[PDB]
């Protein structure tokens, strides 16, 4: 109920601890025409599953700096090669370099690059925004448009869903089967009713 992503009705919790999922919470049953069949997640009598830890999916600073150096050297080489051909770099050329580097390579393909080139001293502004906006910024040290999104979390969500038993395992804890929806594919939520 806590660590299910909000898309499936959970809270979308991120975990920095060691939380075990009991094996009694990985079992579900569905009714077929011939009868009712019971299923379980994590078979072969494995040990109790663990929700993924947030640390395993964050690349450390030192490795990320090494990757940034390598990726930007590679981009410089590719750019010089494309100049010799009078060709513009395509998104496929900078594909292995995607989501790598500080700033991120995908910042080169942003639609605001022309106007962000005149944004000077933005990092001190982000740190000085605490004296203008009452809310406290946990990302005071970076700007998403300039440095890029230095973290990716889709792998963490995939591992969380896999650990929880997938859609079948997660949705058994819910009132999904009480709705008698034929499948979970075409459904969508409504964050606020008309009233």
């Amino acid at each position: 109920v806590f660590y299910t992503p909000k898309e499936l009705g959970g809270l979308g919790m991120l975990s920095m601890g060691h939380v075990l999922i009991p094996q009694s919470d990985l079992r579900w049953s569905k009714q077929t025409d011939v009868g009712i069949t019971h299923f379980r997640s994590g078979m072969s009598h494995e040990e109790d599953q663990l929700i993924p830890n947030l640390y395993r999916y964050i690349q450390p600073w030192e490795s990320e700096f090494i990757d940034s150096q390598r990726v930007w050297a590679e981009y410089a080489l590719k750019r010089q090669e494309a100049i010799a051909q009078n060709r513009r770099l395509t998104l496929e050329d900078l594909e292995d370099s995607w989501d790598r580097g500080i700033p991120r390579i995908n910042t080169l393909f942003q639609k605001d690059r022309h106007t962000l080139a005149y944004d000077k001293g933005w990092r001190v502004r982000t740190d000085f925004k605490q004296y203008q906006v009452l809310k406290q910024n946990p990302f005071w040290w970076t700007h998403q448009r300039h440095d890029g999104k230095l973290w990716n979390l889709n792998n963490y969500r995939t591992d969380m869903i896999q650990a929880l038993g997938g859609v079948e395992g997660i949705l058994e804890h819910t009132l999904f089967k009480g709705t008698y929806f034929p499948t979970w594919e075409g459904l969508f939520w409504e964050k606020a009713s008309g009233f």
């Binding site: 009712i36 009132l175 089967k177 009480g178 709705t179 008698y180 939520w189 409504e190």
Partner: protein
């Protein structure tokens, strides 16, 4: 035993020959299509705000019909008569088939222009998917026409008479994001335009596809507003669709009344059109009563408007009638009967 929270059903106990095989699919069908179970499912869905159907877009209904009469440019795209065939029932019991030329309706309720694109039968040769090809051709013609017209004549809204053409128009107008295409719950009588002889003979006599421009407001804007012209035309089309033969006789009360060669509708004075519209409305109401076994006197003004428009007051099904009883508290429940158990 029935699990309402998980929609699981089972049965334990003795069985006589044939009881279990019957009761298996009996319980399966009961679980699939029970009215009260459906009420529970819908209540849970509404409480959860979980939806399955594609999100509902603005639709031309009987409520926002008044909003249609604005100063902006609107188009009415009808693809009902794109792929059109004609069948005749012979007295021998055999029935024959002969495909005929089709048409595409692009109606402008503001200026009365009717862009008719004749679809010759040659395009259907060697085509497996007739409906898909017809819809894509209609969307292509709509886009071609809207590119032909200048910007100030470009519509701000394209109302589609049939639900299936929303996607082809949506994807074929990617270059015009500022143009909103809408569906219509009510079925406008734009398919009855070809019932008029001047359109039917023209389309049948045509040998190659061509774009034809008409004017359904021939001599009307000189005396009435386009809001009244559209309502009169929609009444005429509804009468033509509902009863073509009687409507033609109504449109010509006397042999003196004549139509100019360049005007589709008879040239009647402003006062005569009032009586003609009253007669057409009486036709529509009487035929609706005949088809539904109801009296025209008891129909309210809103019901009359819905009948004239394409809004369909469909009778609730037997399943839907049971759902309404379960969904609502018993009406004036009277505990007049006592049972001892």
């Amino acid at each position: 035993a029935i699990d309402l929270a998980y929609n699981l059903h089972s049965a334990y106990g003795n069985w006589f020959p044939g009881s279990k095989p019957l009761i298996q699919q009996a319980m399966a069908k009961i679980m699939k299509a029970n009215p009260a179970l459906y009420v529970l499912r819908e209540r849970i869905r509404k409480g959860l705000q979980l939806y399955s159907s594609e999100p509902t877009e603005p639709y031309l209904s009987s409520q926002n019909y008044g909003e249609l009469f604005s100063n902006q440019i609107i188009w009415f795209v009808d693809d009902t008569n794109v792929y059109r065939v004609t069948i005749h029932k012979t007295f021998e019991g055999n029935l024959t088939t002969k495909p005929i030329n089709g048409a595409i309706f692009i109606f402008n309720p503001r200026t009365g222009q009717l862009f008719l694109k004749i679809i010759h039968t040659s395009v259907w040769a060697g085509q497996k998917r007739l409906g898909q090809l017809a819809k894509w051709k209609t969307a292509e013609e709509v886009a071609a026409l809207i590119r032909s017209l200048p910007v100030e004549e470009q519509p701000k809204q394209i109302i589609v008479t049939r639900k299936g053409m929303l996607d082809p128009l949506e994807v074929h107008l990617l270059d015009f994001p500022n143009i909103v295409i809408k569906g219509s719950e009510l079925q406008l009588p734009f398919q009855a335009c070809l019932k008029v002889e001047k359109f039917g003979d023209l389309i049948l006599k045509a040998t190659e596809p061509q774009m034809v421009l008409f004017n359904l407001y021939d001599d009307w804007l000189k005396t009435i507003s386009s809001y009244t012209a559209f309502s009169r035309l929609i009444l005429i089309l509804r009468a033509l669709h509902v009863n073509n033969d009687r409507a033609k006789v109504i449109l010509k009360p006397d042999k003196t009344t004549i139509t100019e060669p360049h005007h589709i509708w008879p040239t009647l004075t402003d006062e005569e059109w009032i009586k003609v519209e009253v007669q057409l409305k009486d036709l529509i109401l009487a035929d609706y009563g005949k088809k539904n076994n109801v009296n025209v006197a008891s129909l309210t003004q809103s019901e009359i408007r819905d009948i004239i428009l394409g809004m369909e007051i469909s009778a609730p099904s037997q399943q839907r009638q049971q759902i309404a009883e379960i969904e609502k508290q018993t009406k004036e429940q009277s505990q007049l009967t006592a049972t001892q158990t």
